[PDB]
Amino acid sequence: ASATRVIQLLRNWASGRDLQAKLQLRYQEISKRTQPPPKLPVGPSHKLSNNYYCTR
């Protein structure tokens, strides 16, 4: 937020709240648009034995 301090105070008084604490517009806090690769585990049926389909 680039709003000057007097306008910030006027906004806080008119709203009756601390508006700067919870700003609707989102800045740097949000997650990066580039992320590391995932690994994504597998399910309970990914076994090499004791896994006959007729039991599940």
Partner: protein, 216 residues
């Protein structure tokens, strides 16, 4: 009829059924030809009574195990199709059908293959599986595919390339093959793998640990 079965019938008729019957335990009658090969001092073919103990046979007719009896690692008692038994079982087991069945193996052809403690037990069974892979007639799906599959898995097991879980996988593969084939070659390929897994699982896991260690 097997040649040995045919060739004892005239003698059986001449001397009578009872004479043949006296030898061996009950329901395990007569004499038997034994071929002792592998890690013995005097590999040989001998004739002996049916229910002779395996240790007596090896130490009497074959000259004993190479390097002494304490050097014995394993014995395949009835040809390549019978599961191997470790030394602790071979000490008191008898060489008849019923006793070897009780020992989780078979009398088979009564071909005793002896392996001492210097043997790569995984490699010998892998060679037997390769034999079965090269002898399969290929007619039925379980033998034609699964014996080759087991051969590949055992070739990897020799190096230790696999993971321990695959051991149980291999066991299941053998069970799939066994009893689902037209003839007993599938049984004869599944049984040695089952014997190796039953008695030498630590060796397989230990080899896999070494392979995982050296390859980082």
């Amino acid at each position: 009829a097997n040649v040995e079965t045919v060739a004892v019938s005239p003698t059986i008729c001449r001397r009578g059924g009872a004479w043949f019957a006296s030898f061996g335990r009950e329901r395990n009658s007569g004499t038997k030809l034994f071929n002792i090969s592998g890690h013995v001092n005097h590999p040989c073919t001998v004739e002996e009574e049916m229910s002779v103990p395996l240790k007596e046979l090896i130490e009497k007719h074959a000259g004993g195990v190479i390097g002494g009896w304490d050097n014995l690692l394993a014995v395949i008692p009835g040809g390549s199709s019978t599961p191997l038994i470790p030394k602790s079982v071979c000490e008191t087991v008898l060489m008849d059908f019923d006793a070897l069945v009780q020992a989780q193996t078979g009398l088979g052809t009564a071909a005793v293959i002896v392996m001492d403690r210097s043997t790569d037990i995984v490699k010998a069974i892998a060679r037997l599986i390769e034999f079965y892979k090269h002898e399969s007639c290929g007619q039925c799906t379980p033998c034609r595919e699964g014996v080759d599959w087991m051969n590949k898995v055992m070739a990897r097991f020799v190096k230790g390339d696999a993971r321990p879980a695959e051991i149980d996988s291999l066991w299941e593969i053998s069970k799939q093959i066994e009893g689902h084939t037209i003839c007993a070659l599938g049984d004869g390929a599944a049984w040695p793998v089952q014997g190796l897994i039953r008695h030498f699982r630590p060796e397989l896991e230990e080899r896999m640990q070494q392979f995982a260690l050296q390859h980082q």
